């Protein structure tokens, strides 16, 4: 029992910033990576980035400029922050645990709607 639970702001206006929290339980953030994945309504999965157990981060090439991923090992939380929202940032956002080339546990996601 690995648990990943995301919480976000819901509706937000364009041009604002966004912060999503991934709270994990049952495993330590120092031994696994956490990936951020999003899914626009009716579309496929889009990889956003990840934070490794050692704190290094990797990001999607296209969005790198608007993204920041960080974590609090202490609090067991991983964060995703995005600047200058666009309406096309509307999507369900998920955090997923990584171990040896696979995302084995996923949270259920949080829907974000960019609406003025």
């Amino acid at each position: 029992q690995v648990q990943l639970q995301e919480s976000g702001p819901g509706l937000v206006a364009p041009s604002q910033s966004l912060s999503i929290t991934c709270t994990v339980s049952g495993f330590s953030l120092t031994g696994y990576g956490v990936n951020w994945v999003r899914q626009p309504p009716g579309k496929g999965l889009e990889w956003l980035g990840m934070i490794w157990g050692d704190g290094n981060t990797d990001y999607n090439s296209a969005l790198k400029s608007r993204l920041s991923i960080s974590k609090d090992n202490s609090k067991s939380q991983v964060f995703l922050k995005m600047n200058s929202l666009h309406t096309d940032d509307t999507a369900r956002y998920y955090c997923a645990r990584e171990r040896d080339y696979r995302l084995d546990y996923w949270g259920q996601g949080t829907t974000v709607t960019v609406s003025s």
């Binding site: 496929g44 999965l45 990889w47």
Partner: protein, 107 residues
């Protein structure tokens, strides 16, 4: 960046049929390929990793194969529980990318 192209985008099929879905890469991913299944209103679930290894609890009716830029997911005699979307994802260097998905619907 390596992109993944999935084919077909949607397939209609009956319970009991055998289907094959493809994931093609725009560059060699050296077998670092995972497959996920996603049902309506749920997060994706790991099926297969490193091309052919089934995750714990996945029915053996599922089998993956491939190398280089060509990978496949075969589902032997579909069960009602198998309809949904299927996604491939590579783990070759970074960034990681997902294929566009294959929607599997009941005929």
């Amino acid at each position: 960046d390596i992109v993944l192209t999935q084919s077909p985008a949607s397939l209609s099929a009956s319970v009991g049929e055998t289907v094959t879905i493809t994931c093609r890469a725009s560059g060699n991913i050296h077998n670092y390929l995972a497959w996920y299944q996603q049902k309506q209103g749920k997060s994706p679930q790991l099926l297969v990793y490193y091309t052919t290894t089934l995750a714990d609890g996945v029915p053996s009716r599922f089998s993956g194969s491939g190398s280089g830029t060509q990978y496949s997911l075969k589902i032997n005699s579909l069960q009602p529980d198998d309809f949904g979307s299927y996604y491939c994802q590579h783990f070759w260097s970074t960034p990681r990318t997902f294929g566009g998905g294959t929607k599997l619907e009941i005929k």
